[PDB]
Every structure is written in C-alpha cells, then in structure tokens.
C-alpha cells in the first residue's frame, strides 16, 4: 500500500526572466524561474536554437528573482526570494555546472505569510544594497559590502517597519554614488476601519514616499510624501547620473506620469488607443511589463498593454528639466507577463500562456512613417495597427503548459496508447497529441526497388564537411553516387562492384577498403592494389575497420591481424588464434588522439562467450579473461560519453558496461524479437549509438544522461548520417524499396506534439466507441458570438455612414474590407456577462472539423457526455449542459437548459431534438444502465428519456453544498462536493430512492476524482493535495470513511486517470497539472526495495538540503502530513552529487554507487 513518486515531464510555465552575464563572460544568458524549478538557458546568434544549460529543482515556491553585480566586478549574482523565511544569494560556476550557496540570512517564519518578507525584492542598480519588503508592515534593508578577499559579505538587517501599511511595488532609484534611495507605493488604511459611515474606500488615494539609506548613521527613515490623484500599479526604473536624469515612471489607467525629487513638476500623458476598438469604451487600460535597453548612445523604454501592443517611450528631457514624453508604436505581440530585451537585437518574449517566441530586431524603427505621440499635443490618440514589420520570427519554444484535460486511449492502427491533451486559452487554444519518440522531417523520397543491405560514406579528406561517395548496395546490385547538390550516378569510380558489398571505410585520407567473399580488396587514389585473394573456397565473414587498424575474421576463428604502417603496406603478425566456434561480430577500440594503437579488444562468438584480448605484440591474440552472455551477440562498439560500452545480442537487450577488462553492470530494458546492432550516429556534434528493432531506438548523451527513446516512424532496417551546411544534423535511412532522408530540427526527446488549432478554450471531450471521434465543447467569459459581432459591425458601419463626413466617408467601407485575424492580433472582446458556446467533432487521424454548432450570447456549455437509453434502440444521444445569465464574481443565476442531439450518420452529423427547463445549471452527466443522472444545484435528480422532453422520476436533497461532479460505477454512484470530500450515494431499485451511507470528515476543495478499484477513490484538491480515500471493508450498505494517502505536489491537478502508458507494462496512476508537468505514481513490489529507498531518502533529507533553504519534509507536509509516499526527485538527485558525498553515503549504506544508480534506474526502466 506504499507508493512511489516519479516525474515524466517538466513544468514549462514561465513567471520570471532576468538577463545578465551570469558566467562572467560577454555572452548574455537568461535565467528563467518556473513554479518550483530554476532553469538557465542561453541563445546562440550563429544558429538561433536555444539550448538549456542548467535545470535544478528548488523544492519551493519562488516569489521573486533579481540579479546584480558589484561595483567593479564582472560577475552577476542571483538573489532569490522564496516562500521561506530566509534570503539566499546564488552563484554560477561554469566548470561545476551547479549553483553554489554563498550567504543565508533568516528573518522570519516560512511559508506565504502576509507580514513575512519575500514578495518584493528591490536592488540598487549599481549593486551596493538590496531591499526586501513584505505585503504589510515589514520592510528590510541589507548592505552587501565586499571584503579585501575579493568576496562579498552581508551585514545585519535594518529596521523600517511601518505600522499598518500596504505596499504595492518597490523599485530602486539611481542616485549616482550618494546614499541609495528607494521608492514604493505607500498606502494607509488606519482611517478605513475607523469610519462606520461607509465612506472609507472613496476619497482615499495612495502616496509615493522615498526611503533613504544613510551609510553613516546606518538607519532608514521616511523622507518624502507625495500623494497622487490616480491609482498606480507598478513603477518603472529610469537610468540617472550621467546618462539621463534619475526618476521613476507611474503607470496608471490610461495615463503615464514621470516623477522626480526636487524641482520637477508632475507631467501626464494619455495612452494611445487603437482605431475603433471592439471592447467596452468605459473599460480602462493598463500596462503589464516593460524593458530597458540601456545603450551607451541612448536609452529607450519598451511597454506592453492588455491588448498586446508594444510602444516605445523616449524621454525628451533637458539637462535638469524635462520638456515632454514622446511615445511611439512599435509592433504587436501576444500577452506576456515578463519580457527582456537582449544585445545584438535579440528580444525574448515570455508569453503568459501557450508558446514562447524569440524575436530578432532587424529594423530599429528610427523615426518610422507612422506619426508619433507626445504630451505637448492638447487633447485622445488613435493609431492603426500594422502587421509585423520591425520584428521577424526566427525561433519558437514548444510549451503545452495550460493543460485542462487529459485522456489516454488508442485510436490509430498501432498498439501504443496515444496521449491526448487539450490546452491553450482563447484563440491560441489547440488540441495537442503527445507520443513517445522523435520528430521526423521529410525532405525527399526516392523509390528504388530492390533489397539493400548496407550503405557507407567515404570522404576524400579526413575533415570534409560534405560526403564524397554513397555506396548504394543491394543483395545482387551495386551502385555508387556522389553529392553535388544535383546528385547523379558517378562515372569515374571504377570500384568493380559485382558481389554484395560488405565493407566501405576510410583507413587513410582517401583509402577505400572493400570486402568480398572470395578475397580482400584495397582501393586507393593512386595505382596501388594491395589485394590478396582468400586461399581455397572459404568465404570471409566480416572485417573490423577503424581509423588506422583493420582486422579480418574468417570461419573457424582463424583471425588475421593487420596493422597499417605509415609507409602504407600492410603487415601480418607471426601468431594466429584458433577457436572451436564461428565468428559473427568483432569490436575494435577507437584510436587514441596521440597513441597509434589501442589495447582494449572484444571478440564475440556463436558459443555465447565474449573474451578480451590485449593488442600488445607480447601476448597478441591470447585469451585474457572470460565472460558469458545469454544470447548470441550481433555486434559490438565503443562510444565516448569518459567512455561507455554497449553489448548487443540476438534479442532486444542493450547492456551498459564501462571500459574494463572485467565484466561490468547488467542494465538492459525492452528493445519485436529483433537483433540489436550498434552504429555510430551524429547528435548535436557528439558521439552516440544507434539500435535497430521493431521500432528504431535512438540513444544520446546530453551532460552524461542516457535515455533509450524510440523513433516515431514505421519499421526500419538500416540508417546512416548526413552532415552539411543547410542540414547540419540529419539521418539517412533506407526503407523497403525506397530511400528516405530524416532530420531532427528540434530536440524532441520525449512527447512530441502536434498543433490542431481550435476556436475557444476547450473544456471537456469524449471518445465514441465505434465512431472514434472527439466531441469537444468550449466556453469563454466576455466573448462575442459571430452573429453578434457581425450585427455590431453593421451597426458601427451604419453609424459611420450617418456621421456625414464630407456623404463622402470612405472609411466605413475600408474598415469592413479587412478584418484583423484573431490568432495573430488577439481577440478584442469585453463585457460582464457575455458567454459563448461551440460544439465541434474532430477526427483523431486528421484535424479537420466535421460539424459546427453555435448558441446564443448568454449560453454556456459546461458538460458533455454521449449516452444511450434502454427504451430506445441503438441511437447515440449527446447531452450538453447550458446555463442562462451566469455571472462569476457574484452568485446570481436565473436558470439553465439541457440539450439533446441524435448523432446522425454515426458521428458525422448532429441535429437538435428538444430542450427542458431546470432551476439551476447542470453540473455533470453520468450515464449508466441506460439511465442518466442530472445534478441541479444542490439537488440530485433522476432523468429518463421521454417523447418531447426529459421527465423527472426521483430526487434527493441531502447534499449541503454545490455539486461539481458525479462519477458512477457499475453498481453504485459517488458524488463529488465542492467543499466536502465525497458523498457516497446508493440508488435503490425496488423503491427507487437515493440514500447516503458514507461521507468524509475533513472538507476538501475537490475538483477531479477517479476510481481505482471497487472501493477506492483517488480524490484531488484545488490547491494541489492528492489523497486516496478507501471505505472500510466492514461497512453496511455514521459510516465515516478513512484516508490512506496524502501528498502535496505544489501544483493544481485537474486530471486523474489510472492506465498503462507503455505496452506490456503495469497499471500506474498518471496525472497532469495546470502548470504543465506530468507525473506518475508507482507502487512498490518488495519490502527490501521499500526500506532501501526509505533509508536513502532519510539520509538525503539531512545530507542534501534544498538550494533555497526550504524544509523538504515541511514543504511536502504543507497542509496534511505525508503518508506512505516516497519522493522520487530527491532519490534521482543522487547522480548530480559530489563524488565525496556519494562515496560517503555509499559506505554508510554498504552499497556501491553503481549499484545504487542501477537500483534507482530499474524503477524508471520498468515504469516508462
């Protein structure tokens, strides 16, 4: 009854992004903070493909992240303020590739508390002090003075606690080498609670005060007090001193204000508005983010609005005063929460939801044709948006973070359960499909009938970036080509290819070696023929080619050793080896960079025995050690990254062995019933191996990481590589009677995705048994129906015509001539209680719509479920819940309706049948035994199909809150409450009554639920808690339930399902979260493994503390204590630990680190 925690995918949601030179060099790098994962990534100007560098889990909630550098240094130090009661300063070591703790100071309790600092982090631009502030009543200031040891030190915190105050935003102000100054949106509320007349919120504005930091007397006191007239949200830093005047900006509703201390009066400027917005005119406009490109020539401030429009604010100021603020229109981008401009024109935009793009500035936009705006123009501003011209898209990042629903099923003709995920929000919503493998790129297809056997590439020079010869050989046909971007058949080859080819390598610079079953052939550019025929009728089996050594193998084990001298002529040793079996595979070690010859050697035999032979002439071709294998080996090879060896056999096993004459570890997984042959491939300019099976497997080594992932294609026999300029990475594979070219643009390590756009945000979808179609419904808040949009546009055009603009108004037709696309320009919509509803049918094989259903303005679709009725025939009916005038923030609804369809033509047509009135909106649809259950508010109705409308038979009123989900099993039914955990309901048959016999004690905000067995319910929580409730086996049919499991993932979970991922696996509990991460729960098999893992976790909890100083046990036991759950992330962190600590823990556990790693990886191999 003990489970194990495992992770499959990593969170992709981006919340913070800070740019700087974290490595100390002149190449900019980006630090991105996930919900609980810290990741470091950098771009590459030459290619543009962004590659992740570091990814470490912090085991906590990060609320802020800033970077700073000392006055004189060249390294950027990362300061992270998390939910804990301590502040941690981080550093990056390129050699160690790990974050190193530097300083740690505690200032209060842990967790997200109102008065505990950690929300707002203020850093002086020069890097002389750091200020951390809380939401209420608490502020702290630190002085980061440096010592003579070229390091940094931290002093005692200062006191700046103001009584009963609220803080909106804190940012530093440049002063220019005098005492640092901090600005914040101070606000008071003492008089609010002292007014019983209900006149507190009104005429109560906020202020902006400056906090001084006197280094002499070492105290902080209030200095200024500047009340405002509007309600700002956040401030903007402005460079001061030499470049520009020191000051801050005041972003507000439809206004931006520049403020400074001294003789600088306040200046306001209206915010420009788009031409004929499709929103509510009374709706306000605010800013979301900004940027600062502090170029030595001049500095400009970027901005972004709610609609997603980028401006360009230029400060036209005098030496001491300011004249006016000039604005400009730049481009339009999807809504983002944090963006940062980089050097060399690189621009990074981190979208709130969906994919993240990296734009490159091609045009600087210096005094564009479109007119600008300024505060010197009296009286609103209008501008016409244009398509993207200044910026061009070069690279994009795939991130299916907003997961709302998950389903696992097999729809195609294959035998692998496909993964369907509905994600996206608004016009960017899409239904992605996740499948294990790698992306396949198709460039050209050539159909050449035959039976190819092998193909090799030989280059005329040792360091050529392009191929020279392609040995297209068949069983009884030979062909050689050459690439010149117009690949044809070469004429001056003269290789004399009649028998099938068995060897094509490069022993020198332009040397070709060919092997045929009647001798040995040597091909050279000059007229040098070192060809010797095999005596008798014996046929050579194979040869061991390498960079400088060639070893041939013959029947009977009479191997002949050949070594190439610098002169060129081959030589033979005076000794021979004899064995009592045959030879099928040979292994030759790679030549060392300096040494001409190696020492390690491996020989495979039919007798399932492999031996190691020393290559020294003293004991050449002699048996050194003995090693046995289960099956007959097929081929052997050695790869680097510090080298690793893999053993191939006749069956689907790939053992992992280190370079050692003695036998190593036995690590094999599923790889059907096909032999495995090793072959070197190209992977991001590294050394890797390739394996063949029923499905091709590709193995790479990224930072010493091994993952045997397959390829998303059909069965393949042989493959090769291809390197060029336009295609730096590519794979050439030969298929049945045809040749294919493959490339891997994206990494595509796991869970490749495909984009199928939708209209609105998906809610739920089901799968038909025989039709095999997805019935997807959508619902959005503050949305406009297409008919309503057309009517409003017609009304606007009529008003424009009636405006009588000299009668001679051509703008009315121009506006209606072209409509802005919703997917590129956003969806401009506004309202308070406007909804939408779309019902669509999609084919899993091809993403094309089938039927379109639209409803009225105040119609909202919530639940959909196909059902059948016993009283009718084989007609499939679809019921969709519909609301009427539903408003979110206040609870007030009028009624709802229930739709009924017919599913004409087995899922490719639908038709409306009838409706029925319900007092409250239905919650969910649960069909069982030809009966459908309807949940109307707190009631529970029983509905059966009628003639003209639904008819009510039985009702129950015992649920004390709103019902937000119903799950039915073959015998009983379970109802999911909104505040209570669960309510067990039994439906009597003889008397037709609904009764309750089981309920929980601890209220839980349950969102989704599932059933694992006949008496086990795997409930979830809105906050993120996961619990399993099982009824006691001695209950009748009060009887309170019990909890047997508790866990806290820290992310909201909205989907639960217990299925099997890989074929031939075991039942696992896979779950997905709104953040984007996907994890599984694995039950243990033996008690020995359980206690070993428990001891490992207990040792690692106190031996390997988290980076941000968060109590891992307390973090996991956030709301409820953890029960019978083992965290797998801490165990998996074993690999990246220091060698000394690994040795210490291995000695403590009386185990070897290889054994610990193998034991840890056994679970992952078994359950993935």
């Amino acid at each position: 009854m003990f489970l194990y925690n495992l992770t499959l995918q990593r969170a992709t949601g981006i919340s913070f992004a800070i740019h700087g030179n974290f490595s100390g060099t002149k190449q900019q790098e980006i630090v991105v903070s996930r919900g609980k994962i810290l990741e470091l990534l950098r771009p590459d100007p030459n290619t543009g493909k962004v590659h992740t560098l570091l990814t470490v889990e912090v085991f906590g909630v990060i609320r802020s992240l800033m970077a700073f550098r000392l006055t004189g240094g060249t390294k950027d130090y990362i300061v992270v303020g998390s939910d804990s009661g301590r502040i941690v300063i981080l550093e990056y070591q390129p050699s160690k590739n790990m974050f190193e703790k530097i300083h740690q100071e505690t200032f209060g309790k842990s967790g997200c508390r109102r008065i505990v600092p950690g929300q707002f982090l203020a850093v002086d631009p020069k890097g002389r002090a750091v200020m951390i502030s809380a939401i209420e009543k608490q502020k702290l200031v630190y002085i980061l003075n440096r010592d003579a040891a070229a390091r940094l030190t931290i002093s005692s915190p200062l006191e700046a606690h103001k009584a009963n105050t609220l803080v909106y935003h804190v940012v530093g102000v440049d002063v220019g080498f005098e005492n640092p100054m901090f600005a914040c949106l101070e606000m008071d509320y003492e008089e609010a609670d002292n007014d019983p007349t209900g006149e507190a919120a009104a005429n109560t504005q906020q202020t902006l005060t400056f906090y001084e930091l006197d280094l002499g007397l070492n105290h902080v006191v209030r200095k200024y007090s500047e009340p405002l007239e509007e309600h700002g949200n956040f401030l903007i830093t402005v460079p001061g001193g030499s470049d520009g005047p020191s000051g801050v900006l005041i972003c507000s509703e439809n206004y931006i204000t520049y403020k400074n201390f001294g003789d600088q009066p306040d200046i306001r400027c209206p915010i420009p508005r788009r031409r004929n917005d499709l929103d509510d005119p009374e709706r306000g406009m605010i800013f979301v983010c900004s940027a600062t490109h502090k170029t030595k020539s001049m500095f400009f401030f970027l901005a972004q609005t709610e609609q997603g429009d980028i401006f360009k604010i230029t400060l036209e100021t005098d030496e001491d005063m300011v004249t006016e603020i000039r604005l400009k229109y730049f481009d339009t981008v999807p809504v983002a929460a944090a963006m940062c401009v980089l050097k060399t024109g690189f621009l990074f935009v981190a979208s709130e939801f969906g994919n993240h793009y990296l734009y490159q500035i091609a045009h600087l936009g210096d005094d564009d044709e479109e007119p600008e705006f300024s505060s010197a123009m009296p009286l609103t501003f209008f501008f016409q948006p244009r398509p993207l011209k200044n910026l061009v898209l070069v690279d994009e990042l795939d991130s299916l973070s907003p997961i709302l629903f998950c389903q696992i099923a097999d729809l195609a003709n294959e035998d692998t359960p496909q993964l369907y995920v509905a994600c996206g929000r608004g016009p960017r919503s899409s239904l992605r499909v996740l499948r294990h493998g790698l992306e396949v790129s198709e460039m050209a297809v050539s159909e050449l009938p035959g039976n190819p056997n092998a193909v090799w590439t030989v280059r005329r020079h040792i360091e050529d970036e392009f191929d020279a010869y392609i040995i297209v050989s068949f069983v009884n046909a030979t062909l050689v080509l050459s690439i010149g971007e117009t690949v044809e058949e070469v004429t001056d080859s003269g290789f004399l290819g009649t028998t099938p080819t068995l060897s094509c390598s490069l022993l020198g610079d332009d040397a070709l070696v060919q092997v045929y079953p009647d001798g040995i052939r040597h091909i050279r550019a000059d007229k040098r023929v070192n060809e010797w025929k095999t005596p008798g009728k014996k046929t050579i089996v194979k040869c061991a080619v390498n960079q400088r050594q060639v070893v041939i193998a013959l029947t009977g084990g009479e191997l002949v050793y050949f070594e190439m001298d610098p002169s060129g002529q081959l030589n033979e040793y005076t000794e021979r080896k004899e064995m009592s079996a045959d030879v099928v595979c040979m292994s030759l070690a790679n030549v060392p960079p300096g040494e001409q010859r190696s020492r390690f050697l491996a020989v495979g035999l039919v007798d399932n025995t492999v031996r190691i032979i020393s290559l020294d002439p003293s004991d050449c071709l002699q048996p050194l050690s003995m090693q046995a294998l289960p099956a007959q080996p097929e081929s052997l090879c050695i790869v680097e990254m510090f080298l690793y060896l893999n053993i191939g056999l006749q069956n689907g096993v790939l053992l992992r062995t280190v370079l050692d004459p003695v036998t190593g570890d036995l690590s094999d997984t599923r790889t059907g019933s096909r032999p495995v042959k090793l072959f070197r491939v190209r992977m991001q300019g590294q050394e890797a191996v390739l394996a063949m099976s029923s499905r091709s497997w590709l193995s790479y080594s990224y930072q010493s990481r091994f993952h045997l992932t397959p390829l998303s294609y059909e069965t393949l026999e042989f493959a090769s590589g291809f390197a060029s300029e336009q295609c730096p990475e590519g794979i050439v594979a030969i298929s049945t009677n045809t040749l294919r070219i493959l490339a891997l643009e994206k990494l595509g390590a796991v869970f490749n995705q495909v984009a199928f756009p939708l209209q609105y945000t998906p809610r739920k979808f089901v799968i038909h048994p025989e039709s095999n179609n997805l019935i997807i419904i959508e619902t959005d808040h503050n949305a406009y129906t297409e008919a309503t949009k057309a009517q409003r546009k017609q009304q606007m055009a009529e008003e424009m015509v009636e405006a009588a603009g000299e009668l001679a108004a051509e703008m009315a037709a121009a506006f209606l001539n072209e409509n802005l696309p919703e997917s590129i320009f956003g969806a401009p919509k506004a309202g308070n209680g406007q909804w939408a509803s779309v019902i669509r049918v999609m084919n899993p094989i091809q993403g094309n719509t089938l039927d379109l259903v639209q409803l009225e303005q105040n119609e909202a679709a919530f639940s959909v479920a196909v059902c059948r009725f016993s009283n009718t025939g084989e007609d499939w009916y679809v019921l969709v819940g519909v609301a009427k005038d539903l408003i979110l923030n206040p609870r007030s609804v009028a009624g709802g309706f229930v739709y009924t369809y017919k599913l004409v033509n087995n899922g490719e047509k639908l038709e409306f049948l009838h409706k029925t009135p319900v007092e409250e909106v239905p919650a969910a649809i649960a069909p069982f035994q030809g009966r459908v259950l309807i949940g109307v508010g707190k009631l529970l109705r029983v509905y059966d199909l009628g003639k003209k409308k639904l008819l009510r038979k039985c009702e129950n009123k015992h649920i004390a809150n709103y019902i937000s989900g119903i799950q039915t099993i073959g015998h009983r039914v379970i109802v999911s409450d909104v505040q209570e955990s669960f309510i067990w309901v039994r439906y009597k048959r003889n008397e037709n009554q609904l009764i309750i016999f089981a309920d929980d004690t601890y209220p839980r905000w349950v969102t989704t639920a599932s059933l694992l067995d006949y008496d086990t319910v795997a409930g979830a929580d809105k906050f993120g808690n996961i619990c399993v409730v099982r009824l006691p086996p001695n209950t009748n049919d009060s009887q309170k339930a019990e909890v047997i499991m508790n866990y806290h993932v820290g992310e909201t979970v909205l989907s639960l399902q217990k299925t099997t991922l890989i074929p031939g696996g075991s039942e696992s509990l896979v779950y997905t979260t709104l953040s984007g991460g996907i994890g599984i729960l694995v039950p243990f098999t033996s008690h020995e493994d359980h206690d070993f893992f428990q001891h490992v976790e207990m040792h690692l909890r106190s031996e390997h503390p988290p980076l941000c100083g968060r109590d891992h046990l307390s973090f996991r036991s956030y709301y409820f204590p953890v029960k019978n759950v083992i965290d797998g992330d801490l165990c998996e962190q074993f690999n990246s630990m220091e060698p000394n600590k690994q040795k210490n823990v291995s000695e403590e556990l009386d185990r070897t680190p290889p054994e610990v790693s193998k034991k840890l990886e056994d679970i992952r191999t078994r359950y993935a």
Binding site: G85, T106, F107, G108, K109, S110, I154, S155, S156, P157, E159
Partner: protein, 105 residues
C-alpha cells in the same frame, strides 16, 4: 529558562553575532533546555553583543567557552525563528544567593 517565569528574552531582530556558552552550560538547549541532537546554530542581536557583553553565556553571563546550538525538537517546532534568546533580566535567585553569601560571609 522555562523553570524561571521571571526571565524575559530580548526578542529582537537577529544579526550576525554568534551566541556563546560557558562550561556548565555546554550541552544544554537554549530554549527548551535539552541534551539531545544539536542541529543548528544560535544567532543573537547586535546590541546584546557590544563592549563587555562580547563572549558571554546567554543564560548566566559567564565566560564563553562553548557554542550555542538548537535541538531537533526546536527546529521541528520552528521555535528557533524568533528573536535572540539572550536573557535581559538579572535574576532574583542569583541576587538572593549573593546577598545570603555576603551576610554569612
């Protein structure tokens, strides 16, 4: 500490100084007065460490020869996340004992 209800801690923001313990207060927890599993270190506010107060026992104010630690129970209860544990009260028992010694020699 707990045995004397007349003693009140400083209860102020901690700084960078390290508390110290004397010979007879070697392996005693500062708050709960335990003898098992010292885990973390004790931090004291700046004003409690100045001039003649440098290197003094937190309980009795004797010469500092040992460091001050926290037990695992205090860490689990999160009672170490508070002000400095320095005792500002002079102690009625010590003064009474000193006066009794003075009267009887």
């Amino acid at each position: 500490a707990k045995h004397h209800p007349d003693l009140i801690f400083c209860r102020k923001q901690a700084g960078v100084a390290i508390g110290r313990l004397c010979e007879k207060c070697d392996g005693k927890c500062v708050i709960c007065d335990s003898y098992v599993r010292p885990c973390t270190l004790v931090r004291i506010c700046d004003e409690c460490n100045y001039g003649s107060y440098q290197g003094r026992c937190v309980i009795c104010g004797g010469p500092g020869v040992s460091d001050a630690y926290y037990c695992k129970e205090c860490t689990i209860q999160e009672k170490d996340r508070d002000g400095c544990p320095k005792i500002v009260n002079l102690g009625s028992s010590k003064t009474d004992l000193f006066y009794e010694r003075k009267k009887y020699g």
